[PDB]
């Protein structure tokens, strides 16, 4: 029999409405006593239209059609109306959470015993509701709770980013592929002639350039994965087919932590072997200056620190489990869903990389600067007769002098060969040429190049100009006898001797020209000034990398909003009423920049292929042709 | 019945002595009236006594003797004295020339018809004088006026050179045998030679030196003639006995101007052939810069002045008839008596050939420091890293530039394989080895060695350098894979590669002289360098022999006059009153000397058939004339 507290006093009516949302009732009187709201039949077939709006974000609309059928028209018979049980109340708060947030849970519908009384024959429980709901365009139905949006339970974001159309797709992928490709290439061709002459090549200085390239052809590999047959689809969607959030989890592939591993290990390593790159340097400077020593075997401390950091880094991001998965860069990235662990991790060792490696560079620069002023004195010794090569000493004189030399222009009339030369950096011999039969040096001149033994040339930076005359039978003949008899002592000749025909006032810019090659000539390392540009041009590009990250930084908290107020609009579950348009009304107030992304990947695959150029000397294709030559 | 004019009024006195210059008179009673000189009869014999060194030159000894009997110890019968007949004292005046040419015939010994009628009986003419006089030492009795010695008739000048000893006349003879010998062997194998392929060795600026050597191999014939059997004496001496002067003479052989035509006319076509060589040399010489034959139509021209010019000389030797015969020489020669034609004929001619053909011999060292400067083209191609290569390459041009060179040196870094060589006559490539485990060439050189074939390497000729370093395995390997591959393409490797280990200023002495000899295996005209020695040879030679004969030139006049004092001293005629030696002689050394650098000559000219392509002509030869091919006759 009916219990006394399972039912209340009221009114039979006949029901107006047969189906209660698409299920037929097997009673024919009901009451509006349940329903709060509602005083007729006519307003709670209208409050259930508005309730109908709950559609989507179906496991709620499961639970909560049985309860608004069971209050809105509910069992009347012999003037008493069937209340509903707790448990049909009590099923619905939980999924119908969207509720309590939207809307709020009326008096009428909240679980009080008064209103809704335990162990009561419910009458809706008999009743089928076959009705299942549906998710919305940007949503997609998921039967796997981890993949459930935000309050949305039943529906989860999609695989395919909603902020980026599909053209915006396409375009993004081109660009990856092309950079990639470029990237992986040329990176390969380097590790390849590193490898055909390593016994050479594991030299400490440019080994660097081996294991620098190396990082970026693995993180070219993470980058390319995207491009085989349905790849990224593995890496970036889930089974169910949302996207991959808080990665590593449970019953999922591994696709997406490679993929992620690959690209932020490599990224990792990379920076940190830049900065062993720029301490490299800045150190084998003070090898010849003063006291430093070369590290020619610091193998097992370089390859500690950078095989080591990146490793404790990628291990702790598994931990906290931020790995998230994106369709437009194809990849699986650290803080992708929470900006902040993209800070954290990526953001900040990219700029401590930039602090520290640009300590290095700024170092080796102020050495490399206080050692030129160490070698900065210049002897001019000039043989003049009518004042044309006085007048080239003296013009070489200033230019040396204006780019920091200390000169001092003497006349060989008035000099003393027997350690003429002692104190000096470089030593520049000038002399005009006379005799009509044959090559004779200028009057003042032949003391100094008949005892040019004592003067102490040997080993000597040196180089010869003079002034002569086509119109004459050996043409700067003088330049010619002094260079012979200074390479025949050991001295160094930086250039080739200049040669003025005619009046010197006429090739006033060939001197200037002459004497700024002359200085040019002086190599203050050679082997090492490549390592300096190479060092200064890999801080170029990550300090654009990490302006790019920055900017992402600044801005992903307005996105993230922008991300969330989108989804959740589009998602159609308007429970309290109808719009004054059918217009969909949904928008995104802000998005990422994709080009700041391109701009990030130009720089961040531009210091592979700027790496790469390395081994473009003339060596690389006598390393090329002994293989070919010893395959043979 | 005797004549009154035929005989002389005196007081006759009997014979104190029975004999008159050794004939016993058939009278008792003489006069001392015929001779003005003497009064008494010991006087008479006295004077005979001095009369009678006319022993000496006894054509004259013959005549005086019944004449100096007629007048110093004459016929007195009756108070009267027998005169001599004009006829006896006519017979005198020739043969004993000797008396008026230094004493003077007397008064009383004059043909007078006073003192000498005509038609009277010569009482010594039934009287026999057995006494024919004596010829000394230095001389020799001949019966022929044409072998009578000055003024001394009846006697000559003797075969053997009175001057020279047996010892010095046998120690010139065994050095004219040897030297002789020696060169007629010698021009013989060279004339055999030039004969055994004439064809091949006609060529005009060598077959020079074939009539060089028939000349001194004539030559050695006539001064070698001497050592036949007896054949000296038939040469030297005439008929008689006596040395044979100014032969062409009348009835004397013709052994003395058959031995002096060989002699003099080998020796003056010798000579006039020396000037040939030195005018082909310097007109050879000088055309090597161009096609042009010089030698080409003057062959002919050649021969005409050769053959001609001693022909000439010997006719004129022949026409003066100044050939006399030497026995220490032991040949014919013009000049021997008389200095003066020696000087004119042998002296002059061999002074106008060392002033002709020493002009020659200038202008060709005048064409020898006009000519090296001009022509050699010289390629220096290097790879060089630290200038070790290119310092060499450098201190390489300044070498061959100094030798006269057209040095083009180049960077490996900045040339084109692609007929790289053509029109260089030497190709000089230089490069360093690189490479830590293996040989690596220095990285400019690289492009050249891949496309060396495309140089024009075939044929060339080329010479490898480089710089290394001891201390890395495989010491130079650059130059060692530079040669293989010039080698393997058909190039012609000059000389071994120059090796530098370590810094190439410490080597440099070494460079310089590895660059020097790079030059001289370059191939140069062997033949004319063989014709320049020979002809500064030849002259040395003829100039030596010039020396010797105007040794003798100015030397000969003062010999002549202790040659004639000398032999006429030893003599001892004395017409009416003891130190006899040589003041001064010919230098037998001097002569040694002209016969050494003579003779020499011969034996030095000879020497230009003395090459590896002789012992070919002659293996050639036998082969050929044994019926033979190189192996046997098909
Ligand atoms: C994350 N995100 C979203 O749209 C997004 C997705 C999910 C949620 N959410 O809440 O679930 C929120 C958002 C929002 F709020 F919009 F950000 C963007 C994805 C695209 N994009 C990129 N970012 N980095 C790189 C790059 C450069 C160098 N290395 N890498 C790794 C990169 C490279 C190529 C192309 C794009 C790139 C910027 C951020
Ligand atoms: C000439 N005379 C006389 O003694 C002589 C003879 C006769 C009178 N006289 O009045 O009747 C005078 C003299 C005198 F005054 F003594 F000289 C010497 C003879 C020997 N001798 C030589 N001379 N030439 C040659 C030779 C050199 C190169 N070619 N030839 C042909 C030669 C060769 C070999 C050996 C000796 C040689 C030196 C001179
Ligand atoms: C005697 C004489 C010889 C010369 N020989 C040469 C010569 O060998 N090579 C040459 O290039 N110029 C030659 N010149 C030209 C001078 O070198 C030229 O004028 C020069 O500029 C003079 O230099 P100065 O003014 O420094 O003394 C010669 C000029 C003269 C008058
Ligand atoms: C990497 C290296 C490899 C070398 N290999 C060789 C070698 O195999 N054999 C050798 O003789 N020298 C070798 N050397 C020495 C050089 O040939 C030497 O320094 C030379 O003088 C360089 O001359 P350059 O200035 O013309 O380039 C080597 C030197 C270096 C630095
Ligand atoms: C919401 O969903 C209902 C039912 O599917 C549909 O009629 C309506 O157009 C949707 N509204 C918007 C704005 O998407």
Same mark, same amino acid.
């Given at each position: 029999?009916?219990?006394?507290?399972?039912?209340?006093?009221?009114?039979?009516?006949?029901?107006?409405?047969?189906? &209660?949302?698409?299920?037929?009732?097997?009673?024919?009187?009901?009451?509006?006593?349940?329903?709060?709201?509602?005083?007729? =039949?006519?307003?709670?077939?209208?409050?259930?239209?508005?309730?109908?709006?709950? #559609?989507?974000?179906?496991?709620?609309?499961?639970?909560?059609?049985?309860?608004?059928?069971?209050?809105?028209?509910?069992?009347?018979?012999?003037?008493?109306?069937?209340?509903?049980? !707790?448990?049909?109340?009590?099923?619905?708060?939980?999924?119908?959470?969207?509720?309590?947030?939207?809307?709020?849970?009326?008096? /009428?519908?909240?679980?009080?015993?008064?209103?809704?009384?335990?162990?009561?024959?419910?009458?809706?429980?008999?009743?089928?509701?076959?009705?299942?709901?549906?998710?919305?365009?940007?949503?997609?139905?998921?039967?796997?709770?981890?993949?459930?949006?935000?309050?949305?339970?039943?529906?989860?974001?999609?695989?395919?980013?909603?902020?980026? @159309?599909?053209?915006?797709? =396409?375009?993004?992928?081109?660009?990856?592929?092309?950079?990639?490709?470029?990237?992986?290439?040329?990176?390969?061709?380097?590790?390849?002639?590193?490898?055909?002459?390593?016994?050479?090549?594991?030299?400490?200085?440019?080994?660097?350039?081996?294991?620098?390239?190396?990082?970026?052809?693995? +993180?070219?590999?993470?980058?390319?994965? =995207?491009?085989?047959? +349905?790849?990224?689809?593995?890496?970036?969607? #889930?089974?169910? *087919?949302?996207?991959?959030?808080?990665?590593?989890?449970?019953?999922?592939?591994?696709?997406?932590?490679?993929?992620?591993?690959?690209?932020?290990?490599?990224?990792?390593?990379?920076?940190?072997?830049?900065?062993?790159?720029?301490?490299?340097?800045?150190?084998?400077? %003070?090898?010849?200056?003063?006291?430093?020593?070369?590290?020619?075997?610091?193998?097992?401390?370089?390859?500690?620190? @950078?095989?080591?950091?990146?490793?404790?880094?990628?291990?702790?991001?598994?931990?906290?489990?931020?790995?998230? *998965?994106?369709?437009?860069?194809?990849?699986?990235?650290?803080?992708?869903?929470?900006?902040?662990?993209?800070?954290?991790?990526?953001?900040?060792?990219? *700029?401590?990389?930039?602090?520290?490696?640009?300590?290095?560079?700024? !170092?080796?620069?102020?050495?490399?600067?206080?050692? %030129?002023?160490?070698?900065?004195?210049?002897?001019?010794?000039?043989?003049? @007769?009518?004042?044309?090569?006085?007048?080239?000493?003296?013009?070489?004189?200033?230019?040396?002098?204006?780019?920091?030399?200390?000169?001092?222009?003497?006349?060989?009339?008035?000099?003393?060969?027997?350690?003429?030369?002692?104190?000096?950096?470089?030593?520049?011999?000038?002399?005009?040429?006379?005799?009509?039969?044959?090559?004779?040096?200028?009057?003042?001149?032949?003391?100094?190049?008949?005892?040019?033994?004592?003067?102490?040339?040997?080993?000597?930076?040196?180089?010869? /100009?003079?002034?002569?005359?086509?119109?004459?039978?050996?043409? &700067?003949?003088?330049?010619?006898?002094?260079?012979?008899?200074?390479?025949?002592?050991?001295?160094?000749?930086?250039?080739?001797?200049?040669? $003025?025909?005619?009046?010197?006032?006429?090739?006033?810019?060939? $001197?200037?020209?002459?004497?700024?090659?002359?200085?040019?000539?002086? %190599?203050?390392?050679?082997?090492?000034?490549?390592?300096?540009?190479?060092?200064?041009?890999?801080?170029?590009?990550?300090? $654009?990398?990490?302006?790019?990250?920055?900017?992402?930084?600044?801005?992903?908290?307005?996105?993230?909003?922008?991300?969330?107020?989108?989804?959740?609009?589009?998602?159609?579950?308007?429970?309290?009423?109808?719009?004054? =348009?059918?217009?969909?009304?949904?928008?995104?107030?802000?998005?990422?920049?994709?080009?700041?992304?391109?701009?990030?990947?130009?720089?961040?695959?531009?210091?592979?292929?700027?790496?790469?150029?390395?081994?473009?000397?003339?060596?690389?294709?006598?390393?090329?042709?002994?293989?070919?030559? !010893?395959?043979?």
């Amino acid at each position: 029999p009916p219990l006394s507290h399972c039912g209340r006093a009221a009114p039979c009516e006949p029901l107006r409405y047969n189906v &209660c949302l698409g299920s037929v009732l097997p009673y024919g009187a009901t009451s509006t006593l349940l329903a709060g709201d509602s005083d007729s =039949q006519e307003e709670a077939h209208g409050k259930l239209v508005l309730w109908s709006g709950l #559609r989507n974000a179906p496991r709620c609309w499961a639970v909560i059609q049985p309860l608004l059928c069971a209050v809105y028209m509910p069992k009347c018979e012999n003037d008493r109306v069937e209340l509903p049980s !707790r448990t049909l109340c009590q099923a619905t708060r939980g999924p119908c959470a969207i509720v309590e947030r939207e809307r709020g849970w009326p008096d /009428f519908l909240r679980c009080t015993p008064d209103r809704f009384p335990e162990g009561c024959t419910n009458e809706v429980q008999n009743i089928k509701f076959n009705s299942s709901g549906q998710c919305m365009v940007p949503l997609v139905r998921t039967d796997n709770p981890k993949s459930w949006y935000e309050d949305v339970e039943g529906c989860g974001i999609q695989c395919q980013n909603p902020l980026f @159309t599909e053209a915006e797709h =396409q375009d993004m992928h081109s660009y990856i592929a092309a950079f990639g490709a470029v990237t992986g290439l040329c990176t390969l061709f380097t590790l390849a002639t590193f490898v055909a002459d390593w016994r050479n090549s594991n030299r400490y200085p440019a080994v660097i350039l081996f294991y620098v390239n190396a990082c970026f052809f693995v +993180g070219s590999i993470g980058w390319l994965a =995207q491009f085989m047959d +349905g790849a990224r689809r593995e890496i970036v969607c #889930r089974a169910d *087919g949302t996207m991959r959030l808080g990665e590593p989890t449970s019953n999922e592939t591994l696709s997406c932590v490679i993929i992620f591993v690959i690209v932020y290990y490599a990224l990792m390593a990379g920076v940190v072997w830049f900065v062993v790159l720029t301490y490299a340097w800045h150190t084998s400077f %003070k090898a010849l200056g003063t006291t430093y020593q070369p590290l020619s075997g610091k193998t097992s401390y370089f390859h500690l620190l @950078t095989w080591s950091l990146p490793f404790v880094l990628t291990v702790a991001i598994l931990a906290v489990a931020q790995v998230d *998965g994106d369709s437009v860069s194809g990849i699986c990235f650290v803080g992708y869903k929470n900006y902040r662990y993209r800070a954290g991790f990526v953001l900040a060792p990219i *700029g401590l990389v930039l602090i520290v490696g640009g300590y290095f560079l700024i !170092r080796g620069v102020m050495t490399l600067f206080s050692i %030129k002023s160490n070698h900065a004195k210049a002897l001019i010794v000039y043989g003049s @007769t009518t004042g044309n090569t006085e007048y080239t000493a003296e013009t070489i004189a200033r230019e040396l002098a204006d780019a920091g030399y200390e000169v001092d222009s003497r006349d060989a009339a008035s000099v003393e060969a027997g350690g003429l030369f002692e104190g000096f950096d470089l030593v520049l011999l000038g002399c005009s040429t006379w005799g009509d039969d044959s090559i004779e040096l200028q009057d003042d001149f032949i003391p100094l190049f008949d005892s040019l033994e004592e003067t102490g040339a040997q080993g000597r930076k040196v180089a010869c /100009f003079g002034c002569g005359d086509s119109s004459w039978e050996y043409f &700067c003949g003088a330049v010619d006898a002094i260079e012979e008899k200074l390479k025949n002592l050991g001295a160094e000749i930086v250039q080739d001797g200049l040669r $003025i025909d005619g009046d010197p006032r006429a090739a006033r810019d060939d $001197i200037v020209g002459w004497a700024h090659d002359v200085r040019g000539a002086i %190599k203050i390392n050679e082997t090492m000034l490549r390592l300096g540009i190479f060092g200064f041009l890999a801080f170029g590009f990550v300090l $654009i990398t990490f302006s790019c990250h920055f900017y992402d930084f600044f801005n992903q908290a307005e996105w993230e909003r922008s991300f969330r107020d989108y989804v959740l609009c589009q998602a159609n579950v308007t429970i309290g009423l109808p719009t004054k =348009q059918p217009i969909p009304d949904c928008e995104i107030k802000n998005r990422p920049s994709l080009l700041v992304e391109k701009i990030n990947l130009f720089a961040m695959f531009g210091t592979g292929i700027a790496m790469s150029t390395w081994v473009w000397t003339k060596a690389t294709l006598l390393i090329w042709r002994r293989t070919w030559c !010893r395959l043979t």
